[PDB]
Subunit: 357 residues, 5 copies
């Protein structure tokens, strides 16, 4: 038998196969099963609020028509051109941008027709989808990105979309992301859509991403910590040289604020206060406080010199010098402990919060 | 009865349905009713002066022709391909950029034909529209963005566009914007368009947006305030160390001006003066003034030392030292009160202005 | 009479109307009149050297053919599809980039055919055109942007383009630009084009734009002026504290140069020197000079102390102290006047120059 | 004989050549040989993680059909239009983005048909491909970029892709890259692909790139080194002037941290620590240490002055002054040697590592 | 005679003119002459390494067929639609990106057919081409950009491309570039291309560009020079105030390095060292040296004070003070001369190098 004659006889002009009519017309809804494979992942940034993912989509649906039953081979592979003739289920994404088809040399379309008439439709597309990311705790957070598939033109009746029981979602082997760690759970659930026009079927896929904490520490935590240590050490020493101390304090504050502003640049603007903000604020507060401590000591010293200028003045010389020294000596030991205890408190609360969430 | 034979018989070659002729030709204008649903909102920035909104557009118009009256089911769903054959009303937007149709797998088009011949036409498109935003008061403002729909090719006679009395505009459930809060009023009004060629119908939709004040405070108000406090405190203490004071003042001024310039970067250039500008200017003025106060005190001290170099000089020693001290002592208490009163005045006037507008 | 039969009879297969033949073939050139309406203006920046303008273009030309003379109504509105059949005059822009047609729902095309056969062709397009902007005086300048329309395929003979005597160019009501003020003159002139291939008709439209001076003052003039005042005041006071003075001078210079470099960033690079450059250079020169004045005074003081170390030395003590003081006292009063006179000179010359140009 | 009659007779309606049927149907897989020539290379950046390469692709496959055997000339050149009629093997790239065909004047397609029926298919395309670059050692690294060719629609059976034994990959003469040096090895290997649908043939090409070290030294190594030298020299001198020393140290630290942050900007974020990070950290540590050394000396000096204020005090004057001087004198000579030895260690270990890898 | 009947008779179905056959088949190669006119030039930047040029391309080739010889007029103008029917020579560019055709209202195509059958084909296109720019000497350099035209599908035999003897390349009148000055030489040469497939004809056009030196001086040379002068002057004065001197030196160095880094930003990274780099390095070296000179003087002064603390000490007081003063006095006069001589040497060598190259 010739292949060409069969190929046109099955889906051509002699065949009553109209691509405008749904299969099993005036009948029970056509069940469609969807299998998704992730070729690659990437392009995730906070400002953009979207992720670009390359995916291979497989759609399988039963067709009573086109059941030739005259060829020994179980299935027949077919060309991309043949797909236009066949009836195709509509697919839409709830948050779809871009998604242009790849057409290098030939369109990337695969058609397989089984003897029973089950049809496999395969396409490769790059989807950019909006992700409603959570910016609550910037250093450590878990982000879930959801992909939703709906039927734009058909109601719940006459077309139902279902997930594949085994191997519904696959991922490319040895695929990694520089910023996030993908979690191997991939929970899938389906939520129907209600509109004024009607009720439309939908299915959802959920992906969990974990941030890598390594970059943030080196980029932000380490410089701030070194700055804080420098300020404290320098402030405690060179007490007699008051211009030297005040100049150091002010420069340290200026660097702290500029660094904090620099830190808040890559991410977008939100009303709520992030953990990084909290850390910057406390560090700035400590650096701020140090200068006030020096100012108080300088004021007390000024009082001592003026009164001395005014035995009766050595009656108060020991008192004022001892008081000022008692301030400096206590402050010097006191501040790192009252900083270490906060640092420990901060890390433990965030660690338990991440563990429970 | 076969579906295919009916489907071509209704809108094909045997039917005199020409897609080049308006329905009810030489007759009263065709009333078209439009329903708009907002899938998503986003991409609003001052420099761009545009907003990107994903929308679902439903157009309903009465057609005397295509009233088959031979099928028991009330309405028939139809394919996107069928739409080209049917006559379609022209739609244009007064400020339209981009707006390319989404065509993933199949074009996102829905056609529903009722027995009476009313036709529902549904399309999903992303429109970028210019918004004439008001930049009067940068921290707190209400922005209204308007969307206008007009008929490019047809005059007021032979095509009229009207709003749906109930549920004219719907919004996606649980839809939020990071920067703005959408207001649930959505006032709709229609303004006709007059041109040299003729009079064309139009309809307008108005959306109200409220800025979130949380980010601006942390980003700008808090650093400026800390800087101002540091400068005042430091200036009042370490009075004897004049190089220390002058150096602090100058560094503080330099940070103030650079921060102000940095603040004026995200937004575009306008002739009028914004509230943020006013706040930066007063803070800079206070920081500026402090240095002049120190300079005056230093000059008086210089006069005291030169005259002393010249009892007759202790006749004026008490006077000059007392005068200089009286300056420093009064200035020190005086400046925060004369700053707090302004801050209170500023916030109350802006709060009443936002409330009334 | 049926509309469809007439519509194909007028411009179809029975009609000898070939869209490949120019009307009035072997005859006098076809006069075409063009009317332009500006929907919106915007996107003007120095670096890009182009402006994006949305425009509605109306082309009117006389056609002897298609003069039906059998329908009572004076004119017939026609669909966009009908336009392809009709012969259309070629239009080109001398400096055209982009200019993609807007095609939302239906193509934005209007066709009107009068009984006499005059044809009105209407299109809406967004044109990006290069503008040869003048960057001579950055703060105040008048920019003229020219739009040129030419016939790419046809010579001067057989197609002439002319302007409409009344209402040739219209602008959208209540249309404003944030940076520039449009001038309501809109002088139109036409210049023919000569090429090796032949002579081609062209028409030109000129638009005048005036810069808003409000933003530039606040952004650049005010910070530089405050810096200059601070430097002068601080330099004159705290004369005894030489490290304090030198440190202030150097920091002030560093801010001046960085601010000047920052200023020269938004605009492109040009050989000629702009007014803003002149202002920055003089301000930098004044700030520069101040330090040299302090250095000279310090050198004289050094000479006084060394000679004193060497009555015979109080013979020269009064002379050296008086000379140094005479320098500081004169310099202090002298510099603002010699700055105010320049500022007055600068503004008056630029104001007269802008007024005359 | 006429050329036109032959040209349609060979591949037209009288010929049974259907472009929907694979050659040698129900037969051994069709061997396809691929030759690749690199027109140009460029656009390689770390953030993008992709490279843009212009390539000329030659596909040669045996066809039993179209073996005319009636023309004396060995091969016939054919037009791009003729290609659509012929059956064409599908080609896909594992990591393909963009890759739009170039179509200036005519499509860039070459067809050559030999007498035996071997067919040469030639196309020019620009491919952007993701490269999994290694960011372990930023200054010196070797990057390998892989290009993979697979058959999307056909399994391993019925289409096999093989490399050309001689001159498989050619490069344009005199082609250079500013950043990287291409290595003339170009190892080619093929790895089959296994999927749920089936087994698909693939071939891989590997390119080796070597970074140029010249820019990085001047940009980063030289400024850091000069800064370190300045800090050490300045710290050792001007020991009596403690405010001068502390101010120098702090400014030097501030520049070091800002420079380090600036350095980490061009490249993306990764968890692991790069060599440049290690170099910045040690330099910052040295600069940091210097200040602590000065602080310790200042503290000892303070102890000496307080005890002196309290012979019995000249019993300890020599001891304290000698101890402080012994610190400064040893530290001064000690630090460059303990810096030179590290620098030598660093360079030798990286040089051996690059040589072995 | 009717025009339509002739127009289809010449190039239609009755005519044996097949657009798939080369003219003069089995005959001598078809000579094609190319004329290029430059509408505009622009978009040249170092990072991009490409230039965008708008060009009008004229192709003239002899056709024996289509020689009607029955119309009195010498040449017939024809529509863009007619071009598809005619055989067209393939054109390709060696380094072509973008180059999309402009299609506003009508496609910008001109066809002219002479009586002898010579055919003129005219197209307007914007070509972005890679330019292998030389970055050896950044301030002054001459850049040559080459445009190459080749035949993708045809070998040297059967299609030859040649230049027009007179007026081969024309430029638009009054066309200027802000950065570069075009040179009116425009040397044209042709180099054949050899490939594995065959030998292909090519032609090349060379354009010479000269940089404008005005911007670079103001942007970079002037600030560096002022900084150098400030540092030298300030260092020489205020010798007794060592903290003041060291602080000035360090701040000056910090500005120098940041300015140098800022300078190296607009351009890309290259291994070789540019002239601007050389200038920055020497200026940094001078500024660096000054601090070391001050440190040496301070060390000598320290030696003098310690020995004095230890007549026998006034035996060495004169010697040490005289030596330190001799250093400062010589250094002060010595450095500008040893800077002026270098500046003169630098400019003369670059000027002769530019003149000879
Ligand atoms: C799809 O599945 C449901 C539940 O298994 C079934 O009731 C329905 O008939 C199916 N639809 C078909 C077979 O078209
Ligand atoms: C549209 O509505 C108006 C007002 O209700 C009516 O006068 C007009 O006839 C309507 N147009 C039709 C029915 O075509
Ligand atoms: C166009 O106008 C000119 C001048 O009015 C006239 O000479 C010419 O005949 C006109 N062209 C026509 C009527 O085709
Ligand atoms: C391709 O090559 C293999 C191994 O040389 C051979 O077995 C096979 O038959 C070939 N395929 C053909 C000739 O179609
Ligand atoms: C093209 O020119 C060459 C040299 O003038 C000539 O030999 C050749 O015959 C020409 N090709 C033609 C006329 O087709």
């Amino acid at each position: 038998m010739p292949p060409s004659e069969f190929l046109d006889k099955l889906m051509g002009k002699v065949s009553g196969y109209d691509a405008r009519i749904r299969p099993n017309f005036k009948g029970p809804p056509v069940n469609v099963t969807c299998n998704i494979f992730i070729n690659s992942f990437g392009s995730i940034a906070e400002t953009t609020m979207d992720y670009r993912v390359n995916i291979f989509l497989r759609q399988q649906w039963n067709d009573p028509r086109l059941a030739y039953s005259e060829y020994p081979d179980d299935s027949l592979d077919l060309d991309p051109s043949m797909l236009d003739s066949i009836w195709k289920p509509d697919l839409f994404f709830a948050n779809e941008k871009g998604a242009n088809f790849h057409e290098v040399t030939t369109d990337n379309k695969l058609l397989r027709i089984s003897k029973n008439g089950n049809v496999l439709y395969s396409i490769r597309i790059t989807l950019v989808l909006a992700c409603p990311m959570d910016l609550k705790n910037f250093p450590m957070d878990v982000q879930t990105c959801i992909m939703q598939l709906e039927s734009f033109g058909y109601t719940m009746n006459d077309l139902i979309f279902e997930w594949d029981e085994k191997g519904a979602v696959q991922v490319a082997d040895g695929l990694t992301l520089p910023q996030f760690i993908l979690k191997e759970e991939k929970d899938l659930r389906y939520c129907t859509k209600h509109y004024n026009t009607g009720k439309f079927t939908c299915i959802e896929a959920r992906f969990h991403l974990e941030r890598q904490m390594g970059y943030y520490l080196i980029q932000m935590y380490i410089p701030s910590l070194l700055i804080v240590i420098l300020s404290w050490v320098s402030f405690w020493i060179n007490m007699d040289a008051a211009p030297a101390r005040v100049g150091l304090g002010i420069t340290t504050v200026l660097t702290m604020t500029t660094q904090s502003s620099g830190s808040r640049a890559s991410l977008p603007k939100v009303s709520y206060v992030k953990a990084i903000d909290i850390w910057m604020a406390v560090c700035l507060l400590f650096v701020f406080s140090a200068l006030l401590e020096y100012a108080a000591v300088n004021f007390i010293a000024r009082q001592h010199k003026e009164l001395l200028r005014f035995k009766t003045v050595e009656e108060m010389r020991k008192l004022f010098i001892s008081r000022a020294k008692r301030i400096d000596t206590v402050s010097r030991v006191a501040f790192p402990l009252v900083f270490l205890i906060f640092n420990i408190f901060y890390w433990i609360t965030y660690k338990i919060i991440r563990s429970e969430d």
